[PDB]
């Protein structure tokens, strides 16, 4: 009965700063892989003993990977300025959590992705993996255009897919 | 290992 | 990476059964896709796959399989439409990049009609300006009469060419031929012809 | 709601191109792709929110310039004859799901000394057709045009019309052993013999030609292939 979670989470700055972005992924509950843009040298790297023996094209793809993430982050921090009618000098955060709950025989028992906005969830989805919680009206928005882009067949191509054989590949580590 | 870009909100 | 249509031109009679065929490359599953452009316009996303359910249902009759083993993602539909005459682009976007797509050199597809009641002939066309000019109509042949080319290469002709007279329900075929030569006239630059025709 | 401008244009090599794309919808992603036969659509460049650039598969003699959230330039500073192709612009909200604009032709050429605009006329019905049929076709023909750049359509009494319309595909070359060889192009109307036995019943076969600028160099005794449109017309008889 193991899990795995990433929570993705970025500040905005006021000014023409970037956000501030990291990335923080568990393994039943425990730290093994961080990511964080105030970086020197902006890399994931290995939280614990059994994630430094993956080769070094792992550390260079998923760090990439974070990049690309770092981009997402600033354009849809923009949108939800837009769909709230915010100032543009305040400051605020985006949080992606998501993630895979394999049971005993190794199946998806639970798949998890969620978006949360200044503290205060934004929209989830529902345990059948096909529906969304919307918290607000800008949620409603969000809502009916995953709806109509099938996002949740989406993301479960990762949830059911990447997501329960990588934490295999990182029990077997342990 | 992260997973692909989300939608835009 | 790469994605591949085998057939660049396709032909189907009205009714009956189409599949366009789509085999791609990728080191991962990609997230598929099938866009129909008609003439004259941009592309317009057909189907899309990302998981689960192998057979993608489109509301338009088609229908497209992924198919893991055998790396595809035909496209289906059990009975063609006039209408459904158009190129057909297969896409797919790697898994890291879903926002980059790659197509396929596309597959037009032409639905030939059934013409219930043929009349081959070919009729002849003065001009509305002066009367010297001339040009050759070939018409109300049967889908399957292919129009060949000359080899005088002074004489024009026109590829098959279907039109469909809505209002009356009614479709026909044609070819046109022409040329500035004196010795030319309907019935002379004129291949595979059907026997039975009015002149 | 994709919008691309211009829809077409024709320049001539070295010349400055740039092809505009406005997108209503919000999308963060945009696209440039061009169309060829035998080649299907290739990426150019594309662009993930406003100021972000992204090599495509064909970037080379092409830039590009995402301003805002709505507008992704093309931008071609030395325009070859490779160049000429048919450019789609495309957004999106979603991997792999492109909403396209309706394209823009461009035509690059060596020397504006071969272009040629059509000519356009109009053929009547044969009577033995209407005795045989009931059924009456006019056929447009336009000829002797370069490059390989025309629009025909057919409007009867001031209405386009698209029913009982064929017209060709794709425009035949007339010498086909030339590299620079012009083009012709037919096209057929059929309507109901009663109906084209009315003479208070226009028809017309009009073709939009793109060619010239006004502004373009023009040393020749000719008639300047500037752009424009030939029309050839015809009048319903009874006889």
Same mark, same amino acid.
């Given at each position: 009965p193991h899990s795995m979670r990433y929570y993705e989470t970025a500040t905005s700055r006021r000014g023409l700063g970037e956000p501030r972005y990291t990335s923080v992924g568990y393994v039943d509950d425990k730290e093994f892989v961080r990511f964080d843009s105030d970086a020197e040298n902006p890399r994931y790297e290995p939280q614990v003993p059994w994630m430094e023996q993956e080769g070094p094209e792992y550390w260079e793809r998923?760090?990439?990977? $974070?990049?690309?993430?770092?981009?997402?982050?600033?354009?849809?921090?923009?949108?939800?300025?837009?769909?709230?009618?915010?100032?543009?000098?305040?400051?605020?955060t985006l949080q992606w959590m998501y993630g895979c709950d394999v049971g005993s025989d190794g199946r998806l028992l639970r798949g998890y992705e969620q978006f949360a906005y200044d503290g205060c969830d934004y929209i989830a989805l529902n345990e059948d993996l096909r529906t969304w919680t919307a918290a607000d009206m800008a949620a409603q928005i969000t809502r009916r255009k995953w709806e109509q882009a099938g996002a949740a067949e989406?993301?479960? $191509?990762?949830?059911?897919?990447?997501?329960?054989?990588?934490?295999?590949?990182?029990?077997?580590?342990? | 290992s992260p997973a692909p870009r989300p939608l835009d909100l | 990476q790469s994605v591949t249509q085998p057939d660049a031109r396709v032909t189907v009679s009205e009714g009956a059964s189409l599949?366009?065929?789509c085999k791609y490359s990728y080191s991962a599953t990609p997230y598929?896709?099938?866009?129909?452009?008609?003439?004259?316009?941009?592309?317009?996303?057909?189907?899309?796959?990302?998981?689960?359910?192998?057979?993608?249902?489109?509301?338009?009759?088609?229908? *497209?399989?992924?198919?893991?083993?055998?790396?595809? =993602?035909?496209?289906?539909?059990?009975?063609?439409?006039?209408?459904?005459? *158009?190129?057909?682009?297969? *896409?797919?976007?790697?898994?890291?990049?879903?926002?980059?797509?790659? =197509?396929?050199?596309?597959?037009?597809?032409?639905?030939?009609?059934?013409?219930?009641?043929?009349?081959? *002939?070919?009729?002849?066309?003065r001009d509305s300006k002066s009367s010297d000019k001339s040009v050759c109509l070939f018409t109300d042949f049967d889908s399957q009469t292919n129009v060949s080319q000359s080899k005088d290469s002074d004489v024009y002709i026109t590829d098959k060419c279907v039109l469909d007279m809505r209002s009356m329900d009614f479709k026909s075929n044609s070819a046109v031929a022409w040329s500035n030569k004196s010795d030319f006239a309907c019935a002379n630059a004129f291949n595979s012809i059907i026997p039975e025709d009015t002149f | 709601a994709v919008t691309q401008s211009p829809?077409?244009?024709?320049?001539?090599?070295?010349? &400055?191109?740039?092809? %505009?794309?406005?997108?209503? &919808? %919000? @999308? &963060?992603?945009?696209?440039?792709?061009?169309?060829?036969?035998? @080649?299907?659509?290739?990426?150019? @460049?594309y662009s993930y929110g406003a100021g972000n650039l992204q090599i495509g598969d064909v970037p080379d003699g092409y830039k590009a310039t995402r301003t805002t959230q709505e507008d992704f330039f093309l931008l071609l500073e030395l325009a070859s004859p490779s160049q000429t192709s048919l450019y789609f612009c495309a957004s999106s909200d979603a991997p792999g799901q492109l909403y396209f604009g309706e394209g823009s032709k461009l035509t690059v050429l060596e020397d504006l000394k071969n272009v040629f605009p059509p000519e356009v006329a109009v053929f009547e019905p044969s009577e033995a057709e209407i005795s045989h049929t009931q059924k009456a076709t006019l056929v447009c023909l336009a000829t002797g045009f370069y490059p390989d750049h025309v629009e025909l359509s057919?409007?009867?009494?001031?209405?386009?019309? @698209?029913?009982?319309?064929?017209?060709?595909?794709?425009?035949?070359?007339?010498?086909?052993?030339? &590299?620079?060889?012009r083009y012709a192009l037919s096209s057929r109307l059929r309507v109901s013999a009663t109906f084209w036995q009315n003479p208070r019943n226009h028809f017309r076969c009009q073709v939009q030609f793109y060619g010239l600028s006004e502004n373009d160099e023009w040393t020749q005794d000719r008639a300047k292939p500037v752009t424009q449109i030939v029309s050839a017309e015809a009048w319903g008889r009874a006889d």
């Open positions: 998923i760090t990439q990977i $974070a990049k690309g993430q770092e981009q997402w982050f600033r354009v849809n921090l923009r949108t939800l300025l837009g769909y709230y009618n915010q100032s543009a000098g305040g400051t605020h989406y993301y479960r $191509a990762y949830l059911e897919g990447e997501c329960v054989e990588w934490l295999h590949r990182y029990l077997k580590n342990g | - | 599949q366009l065929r598929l896709f099938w866009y129909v452009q008609y003439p004259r316009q941009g592309l317009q996303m057909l189907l899309k796959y990302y998981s689960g359910d192998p057979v993608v249902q489109g509301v338009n009759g088609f229908e *497209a399989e992924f198919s893991k083993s055998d790396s595809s =993602f035909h496209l289906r539909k059990a009975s063609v439409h006039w209408s459904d005459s *158009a190129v057909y682009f297969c *896409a797919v976007s790697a898994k890291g990049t879903g926002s980059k797509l790659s =197509f396929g050199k596309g597959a037009k597809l032409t639905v030939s009609p059934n013409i219930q009641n043929p009349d081959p *002939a070919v009729y002849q066309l | 829809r077409n244009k024709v320049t001539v090599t070295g010349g &400055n191109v740039t092809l %505009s794309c406005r997108q209503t &919808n %919000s @999308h &963060n992603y945009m696209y440039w792709y061009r169309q060829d036969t035998g @080649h299907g659509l290739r990426l150019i @460049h057919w409007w009867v009494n001031g209405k386009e019309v @698209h029913s009982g319309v064929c017209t060709d595909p794709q425009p035949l070359k007339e010498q086909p052993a030339l &590299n620079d060889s």
